[model samples]
Target: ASRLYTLVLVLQPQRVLLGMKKRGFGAGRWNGFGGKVQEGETIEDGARRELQEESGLTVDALHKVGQIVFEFVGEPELMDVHVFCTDSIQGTPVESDEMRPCWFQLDQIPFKDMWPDDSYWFPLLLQKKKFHGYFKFQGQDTILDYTLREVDTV
Candidate 1:
């Protein structure tokens, strides 16, 4: 079975807001705001909650930008990550126990410190191109194989 997850990026005219995960699964990495989709919660609703908990900003136009399936070679299930983006911001960012929110200019994204798969699909996000992809990883640092494609609607 595929486990549902969410990842939302707050976009701006020349940058994007991301979070430095303080602890847990992605600790020490800069990533979007998100976590697993809880039971009884819609995908978007789950994303909204994570966004609220990780950073205090309330986005005005939360848009689904892509869907990506992640498979760590030895794992039994796939992680279905729904990626969202928004540019209309309504509040300031407040750090939580889980993350430290920070904004990075478009060209300064710290991809080396992010998930290996991010570099592949992130550029598509910058172009505002909707897409879906699948990545198989040997472990955390190496992608065994992958495929990504754009869609008119995600």
Candidate 2:
């Protein structure tokens, strides 16, 4: 029980990003296309499926930037996230139960609605900067106790 399959999709940021969500933990308010990995399915496959399910956009090129393994000591399982990025894709994002696709200006992201940590490093990652970050949170806390360390630094 370790790691969860996720697709860190990045598109043009927009205003709807404000209405993201009121509260949640761990990518709670961030807009991305991803979910748990299904049995017998490859992590990449899961990413592809989730992208389609969440955004209805068919993606053929998925650039894997990095990975973050989220492990809650007492939790029964761990999350194995496969970080990815894409520059060219087709179709527009639609609202779904999981997320409402929207665009926000690079400087205008709604930090209040997104996972607090997102405001810290996600912006850098989206700018083609590679980084490895460890984010830890529980219940409802905006100040993440996790660390953002460089993979090479480790």
Candidate 3:
């Protein structure tokens, strides 16, 4: 029932990188670069690979920041996302067929245009806390219920 996915957030001292999905599952929403983890690949590698593919950037080290499970009401599969953040990048971001990447000031994140759940855990991410969460959504935009908490270990 669980589908594995990864989300990598590239960070600067006072800013963060986000991608505008050009098409497919999350088209139109602003999010970090990521996608489903391929078979035989480690989750961390998948995160790095997806980042390069979608944003034209690579991270030398990934700090695990959070883990989340998203349940879209009426859908049978649950999406388990491993969230990572890195301050060092190997290249500049460039648009890909799947994503248009850009930076947002730490305080300028557009929560109104992001997944509602992002607003809840983003602060924790900025605080450098490890967290876990579950969000049940009515569809893609309307969150029906959720739970988010900082944990000692993820």
Candidate 4:
């Protein structure tokens, strides 16, 4: 089976908003705000809702920037994640039960504490390039093989 998910990133000239997952699948890692796309919701709508729910921010415009297929070595489901980015946003980030929000300078992202795949594609996001990727993970923290590339459209 394949599952759909969405991830939204709020970026500024020199900083990026990230959330530390407080519980659930990605707990303990700093990452972009997102979750599974609920039934009856569009990917963009799910992205907006997840970001607001986890980070207390409202995004005005979300650009579809990328797509990533995450396959775990032994898992039955592959995560087909739609990645969005936005710079037009409002509200101060507040911690929620799901996440604790934080901002990091572009040069200071805490990649060591984030999902391993993030390091491979996140830089392309920062460069404003559209991308598509597939990663095979051995565990929550290790990637066994992957392919990533810049694209003309997500």
Clashing pairs in 1: none
Residue pairs in collision within model 2: 3-78, 3-79, 3-80, 4-79, 4-80, 13-103, 13-104, 14-103, 14-104
| lDDT by residue (tens digit), candidate 3, 44-119 | 9999999999999978899888899999989999999999999999988998788889899998998998989999
Positional deviation of residue 48's Cα in model 4 after best superposition, in angstroms: 0.7
User: What do the candidate models score in CA lDDT, each in turn?
Assistant: 0.92, 0.63, 0.92, 0.93
The residue-by-residue lDDT of candidate 1 on 42-103, one tens digit each, is 99988888898889877656899999999999899899999999888788999988899999
Candidate closer to the true structure by TM-score (higher is better), 2 or 3: 3
RMSD of each: 1.0, 3.8, 0.8, 0.8
Across 21-117, the per-residue lDDT of candidate 4 in tens digits comes to: 9899989999998999999999999999998888999987899999999999989999999999999899999987788899999999999999999
Question: Which has the better TM-score: candidate 2, or candidate 4?
Answer: 4
Q: Per-residue alpha-carbon lDDT of model 2 for 68-94, expressed as tens digits?
A: 666554466656677777756677766
Off by over 4 Å in 3: none
> Which residue runs of candidate 2 sit more than 4 Å off their true CA positions?
12-28, 72-74, 142-144, 152-154
| TM-scores of the candidates in the order shown | 0.96, 0.77, 0.97, 0.97
* Worst 10-residue lDDT window, candidate 2: 14-23
Over all chains combined, what TM-score does candidate 2 have?
0.77
